[PDB]
Amino acid sequence: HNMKAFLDELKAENIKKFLYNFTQIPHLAGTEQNFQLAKQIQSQWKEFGLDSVELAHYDVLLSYPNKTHPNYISIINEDGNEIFNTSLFEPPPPGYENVSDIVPPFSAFSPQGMPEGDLVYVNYARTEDFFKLERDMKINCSGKIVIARYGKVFRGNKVKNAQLAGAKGVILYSDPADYFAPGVKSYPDGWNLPGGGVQRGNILNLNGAGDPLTPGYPANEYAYRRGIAEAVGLPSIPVHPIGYYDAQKLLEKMGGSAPPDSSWRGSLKVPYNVGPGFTGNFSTQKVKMHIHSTNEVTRIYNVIGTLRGAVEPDRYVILGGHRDSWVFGGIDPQSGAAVVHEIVRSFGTLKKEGWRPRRTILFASWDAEEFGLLGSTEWAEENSRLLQERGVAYINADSSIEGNYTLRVDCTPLMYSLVHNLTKELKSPDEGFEGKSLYESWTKKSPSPEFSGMPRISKLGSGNDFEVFFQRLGIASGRARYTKNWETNKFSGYPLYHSVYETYELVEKFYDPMFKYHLTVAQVRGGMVFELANSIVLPFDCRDYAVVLRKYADKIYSISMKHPQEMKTYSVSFDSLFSAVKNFTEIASKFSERLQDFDKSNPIVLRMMNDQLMFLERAFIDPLGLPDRPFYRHVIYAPSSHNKYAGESFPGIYDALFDIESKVDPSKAWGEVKRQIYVAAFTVQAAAETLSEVA
Amino acid sequence: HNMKAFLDELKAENIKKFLYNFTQIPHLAGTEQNFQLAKQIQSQWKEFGLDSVELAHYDVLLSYPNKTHPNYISIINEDGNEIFNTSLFEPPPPGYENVSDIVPPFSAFSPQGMPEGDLVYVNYARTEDFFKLERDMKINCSGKIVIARYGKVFRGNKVKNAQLAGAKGVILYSDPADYFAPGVKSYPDGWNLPGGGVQRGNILNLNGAGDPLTPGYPANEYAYRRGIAEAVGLPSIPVHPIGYYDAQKLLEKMGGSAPPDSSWRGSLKVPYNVGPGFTGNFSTQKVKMHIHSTNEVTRIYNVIGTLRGAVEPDRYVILGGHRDSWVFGGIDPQSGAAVVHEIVRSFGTLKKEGWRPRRTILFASWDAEEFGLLGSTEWAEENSRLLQERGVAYINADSSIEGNYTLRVDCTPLMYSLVHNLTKELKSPDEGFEGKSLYESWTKKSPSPEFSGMPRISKLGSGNDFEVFFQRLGIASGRARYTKNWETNKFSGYPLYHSVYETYELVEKFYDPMFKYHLTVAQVRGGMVFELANSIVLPFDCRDYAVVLRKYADKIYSISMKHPQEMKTYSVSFDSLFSAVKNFTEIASKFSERLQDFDKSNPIVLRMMNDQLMFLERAFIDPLGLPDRPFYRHVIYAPSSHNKYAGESFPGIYDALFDIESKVDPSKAWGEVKRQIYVAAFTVQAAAETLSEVA
Ligand SMILES: *[C@@H]1O[C@H](CO)[C@@H](O[C@@H]2O[C@H](CO)[C@@H](O)[C@H](O)[C@H]2NC(C)=O)[C@H](O)[C@H]1NC(C)=O
Ligand SMILES: *[C@@H]1O[C@H](CO)[C@@H](O[C@@H]2O[C@H](CO)[C@@H](O)[C@H](O)[C@H]2NC(C)=O)[C@H](O)[C@H]1NC(C)=O
Ligand SMILES: *[C@@H]1O[C@H](CO)[C@@H](O[C@@H]2O[C@H](CO)[C@@H](O)[C@H](O)[C@H]2NC(C)=O)[C@H](O)[C@H]1NC(C)=O
Ligand SMILES: *[C@@H]1O[C@H](CO)[C@@H](O[C@@H]2O[C@H](CO)[C@@H](O)[C@H](O)[C@H]2NC(C)=O)[C@H](O)[C@H]1NC(C)=O
Ligand SMILES: *[C@@H]1O[C@H](CO)[C@@H](O[C@@H]2O[C@H](CO)[C@@H](O)[C@H](O)[C@H]2NC(C)=O)[C@H](O)[C@H]1NC(C)=O
Ligand SMILES: *[C@@H]1O[C@H](CO)[C@@H](O[C@@H]2O[C@H](CO)[C@@H](O)[C@H](O)[C@H]2NC(C)=O)[C@H](O)[C@H]1NC(C)=O
Ligand SMILES: *[C@@H]1O[C@H](CO)[C@@H](O[C@H]2O[C@H](CO)[C@@H](O)[C@H](O)[C@H]2NC(C)=O)[C@H](O)[C@H]1NC(C)=O
Ligand SMILES: *[C@@H]1O[C@H](CO)[C@@H](O[C@H]2O[C@H](CO)[C@@H](O)[C@H](O)[C@H]2NC(C)=O)[C@H](O)[C@H]1NC(C)=O
Ligand SMILES: *[C@H]1O[C@H](CO)[C@@H](O[C@H]2O[C@H](CO)[C@@H](O)[C@H](O)[C@H]2NC(C)=O)[C@H](O)[C@H]1NC(C)=O
Ligand SMILES: *[C@H]1O[C@H](CO)[C@@H](O[C@H]2O[C@H](CO)[C@@H](O)[C@H](O)[C@H]2NC(C)=O)[C@H](O)[C@H]1NC(C)=O
Ligand SMILES: *[C@@H]1O[C@H](CO)[C@@H](O)[C@H](O)[C@H]1NC(C)=O
Ligand SMILES: *[C@@H]1O[C@H](CO)[C@@H](O)[C@H](O)[C@H]1NC(C)=O
Ligand SMILES: *[C@@H]1O[C@H](CO)[C@@H](O)[C@H](O)[C@H]1NC(C)=O
Ligand SMILES: *[C@@H]1O[C@H](CO)[C@@H](O)[C@H](O)[C@H]1NC(C)=O
Ligand SMILES: [Zn+2]
Ligand SMILES: [Zn+2]
Ligand SMILES: [Zn+2]
Ligand SMILES: [Zn+2]
């Protein structure tokens, strides 16, 4: 009927209702119950109105602890073992006293083993630096259990960087210093992190992507698995998660040496000593890890709803988010799955009245995402050939909240204008903004730098299910949540990240009581999907990619100019890239201009025009992918070989330049940079020629 | 105006005329004259009617001999050198007495050097077997100049396989046994091969593809070259071409041992002895190679004509062939470039009358093709992003003749019906077929096996410029020449292959005097291009790919069943592949059925339908390419890792199974096969799902 009709049908009492139906039971990927909910969402979506809706399943390498011989850490001495055994679970949150299946905190895909040894504290594991700083104090971690605190680099590396040091095992704990909001209680009546609360998470290093055994190809029934030994990124030494009341007891007896800088202190009731083993009455004392987990090929299910387009049924607009959780999924991911759920119900409500989108809309409820985005990925490995030629845009939908302090958006420069324009025509739920545009609300609370006349839109890359569609296939995409003030709280995710206490009540009673915020994100998300899958000419605006590219070039250029001498020494130019960028900007100009003058009456032209737009995003994908990582192919946006969080764009160049100073062979060193500058340039140029007049 | 109008405008007196204008001067790729002709064809095409026409150029690693210190081989003894020095050129053919620039026979990209050593004859170099048969007679070729005869495996390997034996250098000669048509004279009044005639050719091993220095990326002005040392497939020991009058003198004094089988005899006025060095009065005698050639980064030019479509200007149909020759290019490639030339002139003639093709037609005159398909490739490396999403079909056009005995076609099963249907409505030039369809002529003279009710259509793969478009990008394509009787002459190419005597007169006076054949191929070629770039629904017919796939599976399946025991031992099934094939066939069925029922009135559907067709060919491309060769990505058709000429389809599986008997680790051995069967299957299946109902 019309955009409005759609939005207006999105009620909060439903998303609230839904969140509740999804939170009561543990839905660990592969579990006998995650499957029941799969079936549920399947059935429920057919009822709302979807045309097609089925389960996509793959046999994926998953991993769980042995219910019989539980995992834990402890301290040993003169043949004495019992000396303090770790928690065997997390104190079940309130109402969830007697609830079967809650799985004991555990690092996924950890190798079996019961290693004995001294400990060596490490600021958030090897942020590279931190372990590249054990030479400043003679420390051969080899044969020593390194304990590190979550934060900074994605935990995987923490474990891997830990292997490159010699580690015998890894103790990863959630330190208050990082995520423990100043001035709040511990979950029950908290909102913050309880001492017994542990943060689950997987330690796979699938740099690129896939099930650790089916790289490039689907984990279908007739597939050929690799074999643990030759798998993809499995850790080589045991790993286990600790709560801080529990981390303290370990860091307590910790008897090391001079803790480098003042940053290595995690604000705990103890002194942060790095040095090996314990001291004093504790000298024969040593920590022992007990991990008895097994990796199993498990069947996983993806729910895939389908709403046939009316005009361009061969063009796909995807709205997807994972359903598989770690325990209940208060926020991650149920807080998002419900929004999706309402969004479908609404489109469904609309299909029943006799309406269809211009383009086709696909809804997915990914599985195994907490185990390495397995679900979404393998389904895409499978349908590349179609997404590749039909993928229009992909909108991801995991957690919907993190705060009350405004809207958060991440997306391909193509969808900026869309986000902008849409958000302007949307009611702001924020407190103190009666009848104010969501845009107004959003802008004021987090002004986009450089041109604060508008909202801050960040980049995608690395993380949720969108990873595949964006950094591997090249499908324009974005995400949108509700977050905290970027200055009051400086830390990463929300406290209680992958913890037990991530429960329904936690949201309803501390985050979004009225569910305003959830409803908003829902309108935001909905709109995107809607516009994308229904607006005559695609909601993309190439000009923006121009604008950003320049900035990108400048930023990367100045990184290189941090060696003005070495640059002229080895003849390292940048005109090429900057050139390419230039034309892109000039080429995009004319295309945009040319986009308004054509008579939208003639389809083929419209289409031809549209495909230029659709495929532009794909134009930035280099088939050969990045260096030693083939599943990251987005020349522009893509995880940096090195620091994935503190990274930039033009990863190729960045990694090339990263720490070039101490590069042993000064010549090849710049050859590489001098090289990526080339590719980056080539790509930008080619990406541009796309928008250049066909024929 | 109409298909006919086009064909009827193709006159023989022009193609004849053209061939003459292109043959009078040496156009070695990169030469100051190959560039003049580039400019010529550029100008000439604009005049015929093309809308756009420009030069695409890249700086490519080429290679030529030193005009001052000429290359040659010879025999040495007790400090005596002069003992028989090789020919320093080929006796200039007739009228071409005083013609500057004729380049002395030479193996391209050969390393410098003047090695001394005994010789060791080898049946057509290591067909693998031949060198894998020097153990049956204690022979460490190490530090020994191996001389081998062109034939069987593509010369590159001959040289490489020669390196794996220890070779110090390589003497490659054109032996009569193989190509010397029984019952003909030596060129001048010949048609056959003169004794002094030498066959040029490059020895690069670009398995995948590209300029040996710009792999994956264009050899544009700002590119970053690799560096000889770390180049792609350069030989590591000198190589030089010999004529047989000259090969004899070397094989003459040849004093070896027991020449294995009876096949190692090249019908020369001498006994074919393998064994090291010479015998008798010749014992201190040893051959010395003198190669002083240099590899240089040379500018190359590609002429690219453009005829804007009228409806689908974003969809490309390409007609292309190389222009760069080795000396004059009697046949290869001028014999084809003229056909193209006439074809353009005709379409041009037609554009001027106020007509345009539905789809866009692109005409290319590739450069550097004799040096490693460099021209075509690098232009494609550059425009992948467009061909990838707009490439409809690519028709190659090198030599147009090889015989008088009927038509030859090679092409993606998709274009069979097109070739069939087109050829039926075409006049047959053959002698003894007055008013008979070219189809009739063609069928009768070479019946397609299995279903002889129709013409034999062979597969593409490895060779001419189409390599890129087909085995790397995945663009449906084909070729068409006029060849010899497949039974009267059993050898490979035509005598005088890459020789001097490949001259205009050679064609006009021995091959196609009236130019009937050239005109035909021209209509054949034209038609393809025409239909493809103008017929409403694409001239493709997926059903055929079904039919062929089965056959392929069967054939490969039976190769595996050559070990019924080992198969059950290691659980090696084939149901998956056969399954996939099944559905493909079933899926294609419905798509085809579904293709006739839709109302061709509604464009978008037509288009959606069309893209299914267009992209099907691309559906068979595995991004990860084949094992240790990333530029060969066509799961179905693609050079076999091992025997490139005597190879099959499903290369993955084939190579996996090839010589599995003597595979050291019997377990991993089948793991690999058990693996490719998987991928092949996956691909076939995925390739099929493409044709499955969108949305
Ligand atoms: C969970 O751990 C137990 C350890 O008791 C595993 O049992 C092993 O296998 C069988 C019993 O299934 C015993 O004969 C072995 O002695 C046990 N060895 C070990 C690992 O201690 C059990 O297999 C594990 N869970 C399962 C069934 O996979
Ligand atoms: C959600 O927003 C409310 C505001 O409506 C937050 O409440 C304040 O939280 C801060 C801590 O950041 C306290 O210092 C204040 O005392 C609280 N009330 C005031 C004065 O606003 C609430 O903490 C937020 N919780 C989240 C992020 O869900
Ligand atoms: C977002 O909205 C703005 C204005 O509402 C659009 O830009 C204007 O578009 C109209 C017609 O589309 C043109 O006549 C104006 O010249 C444009 N002005 C500006 C500010 O450029 C913009 O195209 C919209 N973007 C999308 C696709 O949502
Ligand atoms: C062609 O070969 C000659 C050999 O005489 C090369 O000359 C070398 O380089 C200079 C002259 O250009 C002399 O000083 C050297 O002594 C020569 N050395 C060699 C290879 O013998 C000449 O360079 C070659 N062609 C070119 C100019 O590239
Ligand atoms: C082209 O075709 C003619 C036939 O029109 C060939 O002439 C015959 O060639 C064979 C050798 O294959 C001789 O034995 C005959 O004596 C020739 N005449 C007859 C009886 O047909 C001619 O050789 C062919 N040359 C090519 C391949 O261009
Ligand atoms: C080649 O020609 C044949 C017949 O001339 C085509 O097949 C017939 O096509 C018509 C209409 O297209 C159908 O009504 C018949 O049922 C078809 N019969 C057969 C033999 O299948 C065929 O489609 C043509 N192929 C192309 C695309 O050139
Ligand atoms: C979530 O809601 C659905 C429907 O509102 C519930 O549906 C199931 O349970 C009902 C009993 O309360 C049965 O009568 C339905 O037949 C059954 N259908 C489905 C969807 O499988 C579902 O149980 C709710 N989840 C819970 C238990 O909270
Ligand atoms: C091939 O044919 C062309 C045109 O028919 C020739 O054209 C060039 O030479 C002419 C002299 O014969 C000049 O008058 C033309 O201006 C010039 N134009 C071009 C195409 O460059 C061309 O020389 C012929 N090639 C030869 C020498 O055989
Ligand atoms: C919560 O109470 C129940 C019932 O008293 C306890 O569950 C026990 O019985 C269940 C069958 O109804 C089994 O599924 C449980 O495995 C079993 N629990 C034990 C003793 O292992 C349950 O333990 C209580 N909650 C807890 C774990 O303290
Ligand atoms: C063919 O005759 C010519 C002229 O007599 C010879 O060419 C010589 O003069 C040319 C200038 O017109 C130069 O370009 C040639 O390099 C030069 N040739 C020599 C002697 O090296 C030509 O040699 C004769 N053909 C041959 C090579 O025998
Ligand atoms: C570990 O579990 C408890 C924890 O305090 C300890 O008392 C016990 O001795 C240890 N396990 C055993 C029984 O060896
Ligand atoms: C466009 O930018 C490219 C960068 O690759 C540059 O080389 C080229 O010269 C520019 N276009 C023009 C007008 O030449
Ligand atoms: C090689 O060239 C001729 C060929 O017979 C020979 O006579 C000569 O001695 C050799 N080169 C020289 C002059 O050393
Ligand atoms: C189609 O073929 C595939 C081969 O991958 C097979 O697994 C599948 O079962 C077939 N389709 C059906 C109807 O299941
Ligand atoms: Zn999540
Ligand atoms: Zn998560
Ligand atoms: Zn050729
Ligand atoms: Zn050739």
Q: Which residues contact A684 (CB under 8 A, 6 or more apart)?
A: A549, A577, A580, A581, A584, A635, A636
Query: Which residue puts its alpha carbon closest to atom 5 of ligand 12?
Result: A580
Distances (CA, A) of B60 to A82, B49, B215: 71, 31, 11
| Catalytic-role residue among A376, A531, A634, A649 | A634
CB B277 within 8 A of CB B286: yes
Same domain, A177 and A302: no
Residue carrying the six token digits 């046994």: B177
Which residue shows structure tokens 């501390």? A510
Q: Which amino acid is at B142?
A: S
Q: Which residues of B498-527 are buried (b: 16+ CB within 10 A; e: fewer)?
A: bbbbbbbbbbbebbbeebbbbbbbbbbbbb
Q: Confirm whether B642 is a catalytic residue.
A: no
The pairing of strands B52-64 and A116-117 is unpaired
Residue with tokens 């790509």: A683
Question: What's the CA-to-centroid distance between A85 and ligand 11, angstroms?
Answer: 6
A403 ligand 2 Cβ < 6 A: yes
Residues of A in contact with B308 (CB under 8 A): 695
Residues A153 and A193 grouped into a single domain: yes
Say whether A291 sits in a helix, a strand or coil.
Answer: strand
Atom 10, ligand 14: which residue's CA is nearest? B583
Minimal Cα distance from A614: which residue of B? B389
Give the DSSP letter string of A129-166: GGGTTSTTTT---TT-EEEEES-SS-HHHHHHHHHTTT
Q: How far is the CA of A106 from the centre of ligand 9 (A)?
A: 22
A469 and A544 inside one domain = no
Query: In 3-state terms, what secondary structure has residue A582?
Result: helix
Q: How many other β-carbons are positioned within 10 Å of the β-carbon of residue A434?
A: 8
From which experimental method does this structure derive? X-ray
Q: Do A453 and A195 meet the contact criterion of CB atoms below 8 Å apart?
A: no
DSSP state of A325: B
Helices (H), A194-317: 244-253
Ligand nearest to the CA of A345: 7
Pairing type for strands A286-290 and A72-76 reads: antiparallel
Q: How many of the other CB atoms lie within 10 Å of CB of A606?
A: 18
Instruction: Specify the ligand 7 atom closest to the Cα of A44.
Output: 20
In this structure, the answer to whether residues A312 and A244 fall within a common structural domain is no
Burial class (CB in 10 A: 0-12, 13-18, 19+), A227: exposed
- Cβ contact, residue pair A386, B689, below 8 Å: yes
The single-letter code of the amino acid at B521 is V
Secondary structure element (H or E) that encloses residue A60, with its range: strand A52-64
CB–CB contact B607 A611 (8 Å):
no
Q: Does residue A315 share a domain with residue A256?
A: no
Tokens (6 digits) for B245: 């009058």
Residues B678, A222: C-beta atoms closer than 8 Å: yes
- Does B420 qualify as catalytic in the annotation? no
What are the backbone dihedrals phi and psi of residue A487, each rounded to the nearest 5 degrees, phi first?
-115, -30
The DSSP annotation for A401-456 comes to BS-SS-EEEEE-GGGHHHHHHHHHTSB--STT-TT-BHHHHHHHHSBPSS-TTSB-
- Phi then psi for residue A408, to 5 deg, are -125, 130
Burial A166-185 (b: 16+ CB within 10 A, else e): bbbbbbbbbbbbbbbbeeee
Residues B203 and B343 occupy one common structural domain: no
Beta carbons within 8 Å of B449's beta carbon, 6+ residues apart: B456
Q: Going edge to edge, which strands form the sheet with B239-242? A: B145-149, B169-173, B239-242
Nearest CA in chain B to A577: B222
Contact state of B217 with A678 under an 8 Å Cβ cutoff:
yes
Q: How far apart are CA A72 and CA A163, in angstroms?
A: 20
Amino acid identity, residue A147? I
Q: Are B274 and B149 in contact (CB under 8 A)?
A: no
Q: Please indicate whether, in this complex, the C-beta atoms of A312 and B222 are within 8 angstroms of each other.
A: no
Query: Among all chains, which residue has been given the structure tokens 């009697």?
Result: B330
Using the atom order of ligand 12, give the atom closest to the CA of residue B221.
7
Q: Do A223 and B678 touch (CB under 8 A)?
A: yes
Helix (H) or strand (E) holding A58: strand A52-64
Tokens coding B42? 């550029």
> Which H helix or E strand runs over A528?
helix A516-534
Domain of residue A647: give its range: 540-695
What residue in A sits closest to B51 (Cα-Cα)?
A: A695
Closest listed residue to residue A624, CA positions, set B209, B467, B673: B209
CA of A209 to the centre of ligand 14 (A): 25
Please indicate whether residue A583, judged by its CB atom, sits closer than 6 Å to ligand 12.
yes
Tell me the resolution in Å: 3.5
Point out the catalytic residue in the list A369, A467, A544, A617: A369
- φ and ψ of A340, to 5 deg: -50, -55
User: Cα dist. B682→B341, B471, B610, B632 in Å?
Assistant: 42, 18, 24, 17
Pairwise CA distance, residues A329 & B142, whole Å: 68
In whole angstroms, give the CA distance from residue B198 to residue B9. 39
Ligand with minimal distance to A79 CA: 11
Mutation choice for ligand 1 from A66, A67, A112, A292, CB with most ligand atoms inside 8 A:
A66
Among A662, A214, A338, residue whose Cα is nearest residue B675: A214
Strand B391-396 vs strand B312-322: parallel, antiparallel, or unpaired?
Answer: parallel
Domain CATH code at residue B436? 3.40.630.10
**Residue A573 annotated as catalytic:** yes
Burial B141-180 (b: 16+ CB within 10 A, else e): beebbbbbbbbbbbbbbbbbbbbebbbbbbbbbbbbbbbb
Instruction: Find the CATH number of the domain harbouring A609.
Output: 1.20.930.40
Catalytic residue among B74, B384, B448, B573: B573
Residues with a beta carbon under 5 angstroms from ion ligand 15: A 332-333, 398
- Chain A environment of B390 (Cβ under 8 Å): 694
Choosing from B511, B539, B567, the residue where a domain stops is: B539
Q: Is-contact A570 A656, C-beta < 8 A?
A: no
Q: Are residues A608 and A587 in the same domain?
A: yes
Q: Are residues B54 and B147 in the same domain?
A: no
Q: Where are the alpha helices (DSSP H) in A184-236?
A: none
After which residues is the backbone of chain A broken at C–N > 2.5 Å?
Answer: none
Taken as a whole, chain A contains a residue count of: 695
Report how many domains make up chain B.
3
Residue B119 and residue B142: Cα distance in Å, rounded? 11
Residue nearest to atom 5 of ligand 14 (CA): B580
**Centroid of ligand 9 to alpha carbon of B157 (angstroms):** 71
Q: Which two tokens stand for residue A489?
A: 């709280």
Among chain B residues, the shortest Cα distance to A381 is held by: B686
Same-domain status, B387 and B446 = yes
Q: How many residues does chain B have?
A: 695
Q: Which of A220, A306, A682 sits opposite B217 (nearest CB)?
A: A682
End position of a domain, from candidates B517, B539, B561: B539
In this structure, the answer to whether residues A318 and A258 fall within a common structural domain is no
Give me the numbers of helices (H) and strands (E) for chain A, helices first please.
18, 18
∠ Cα B687 B690 B694 (to 5°)? 170
Please give the annotated binding residues of A for Zn(2+), written as ranges: 322, 332, 370, 398, 498
Ligand 6 shell residues, CB under 6 Å: B 417-418, 421, 539
| Sign of the alpha-carbon dihedral angle for A84, A88, A89, A91 | negative
Q: Which long-range contacts (CB under 8 A, 24 or more apart) does A655-659 make?
A: A655/A626, A655/A627, A657/A556, A657/A559, A657/A560
Q: Which residues contact B380 (CB under 8 A, 6 or more apart)?
A: B387, B468, B469, B472, B473
Q: Which of B225, B256, B291 is the last residue of a domain?
A: B291
Q: What is the CATH number of the domain that holds A113?
A: 3.50.30.30
Instruction: Give the binding-site residues of ligand 14, using a 6 Å CB cut-off.
Output: B 579-580, 583, 681, 685
* A678: chain B residues, CB-CB within 8 Å: 217, 222-224
- Give the alpha-carbon dihedral of A38, A43, A48, A53, to 10 degrees: 70
C-beta atoms of B603 and A603 within 8 A: yes
Helix (H) or strand (E) run with residue B652 in it: helix B651-657
CA distances from A421 to A541, B114, B314, B521 (A): 12, 73, 30, 58
DSSP B439-453: HHHHHHHSBPSS-TT
Q: Strand A52-64 to strand A72-76: parallel, antiparallel, or no bridges (unpaired)?
A: unpaired
Instruction: Answer for the pair A680, A653: CB distance below 8 angstroms, yes or no.
Output: yes
Q: Which of A73, A81, A82 to mutate to test the pocket of ligand 11 (most atoms within 8 A of CB)?
A: A82
- Taking CB atoms and an 8 Å cutoff, what residues of chain A touch B694? 313-314, 360, 386, 390
Record: contact B604-A607, CB cut-off 8 A: yes
Q: Are residues B519 and B613 both part of a single domain?
A: no
d(CA A229, CA A211): 14
Q: Cα(B104)–Cα(B90) distance, rounded to whole angstroms?
A: 7
Clarify whether B27 is annotated catalytic: no
Please state whether the peptide bond connecting residue B333 to the residue before it is cis, i.e. omega within 30 degrees of 0: yes
Is there an atom of ligand 9 within 6 Å of A98 CB?
A: yes
Q: Are residues A479 and A441 in the same domain?
A: yes
Contact B385 A686 (CB under 8 A): yes
